[PDB]
Amino acid sequence: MLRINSDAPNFDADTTVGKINFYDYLGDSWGVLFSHPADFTPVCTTEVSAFAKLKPEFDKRNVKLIGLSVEDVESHEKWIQDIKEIAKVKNVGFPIIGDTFRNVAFLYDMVDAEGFKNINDGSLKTVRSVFVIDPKKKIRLIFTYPSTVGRNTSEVLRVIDALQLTDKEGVVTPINWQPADDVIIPPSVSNDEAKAKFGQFNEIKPYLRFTKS
Ligand code: NA
Known part of the structure; x- marks a missing residue:
């Protein structure tokens, strides 16, 4: 299927x-x-x-x-x-x-x-x-x-924005995300790699790190 x-x-x-x-x-x-x-x-x-x-x-x-x-x-x-x-x-x-x-x-x-x-x-x-x-x-x-x-047309647009953003920047979006909100660094990305690519991030847990959009 x-x-x-x-x-x-x-x-x-x-x-x-x-x-x-x-x-x-x-x-x-x-x-x-x-x-x-x-x-x-x-x-x-x-x-x-x-x-x-x-x-x-x-x-x-x-x-x-x-x-x-x-x-x-x-x-x-x-x-x-x-x-x-x-x-x-x-x-x-x-x-x-x-x-x-x-x-x-x-x-x-x-x-x-x-x-x-x-x-x-x-x-x-x-x-x-x-x-x-x-x-x-x-x-x-x-x-x-x-x-x-x-x-809901707004939701269709919201997900499109999230998908495009994730593809473009290699980030992931949290529940209820709206554009300009902070994004999440994918776990496949190490902290050092994250520092290189994104700069600063807020590590809530090792797997949950927010960074600015
Ligand atoms: Na940091």
Whole structure:
């Protein structure tokens, strides 16, 4: 099964922006792949609307958004029109994948079978995962909220910031970290190595050393 640190599988799909190859779409950017069981459902509609409004926040972090929903592109196009109206956005700048037969969802381990459309029978309730993918196509973080509970855009941005920072500076982030807060030196780094790389640090315990960001 796919887990954090697994490679995000590549695929070809029909989308609201035309046919794409996932890796090609992503390029060297980070990616956020978010999933929906069906179009014209309320929580998901609010969620896509929020991502659309906030796309500039993602753009500045070199992150490309992509949505998946188990319906055809034609349906997604109509849904986007509603989303534009609701969100009061001029356009939705990212694609929504038309996964009519659940093939992509299946590839991403959200369902145990592919080849059939959305029947409103409950088999699609699990098509709700969000995958944060790095420039090397590694899945870095996953979260799955049920369609009943809307996601948190701020948290998605927070984790992206933490992940990027950790990759950039070789640090780790504590619970509830916000940017500009102090970070933690990874245990793989010796105190001497830490002095060389970070300067000063506060050793709470030998394994827990805070340093400034
Ligand atoms: Na020190």
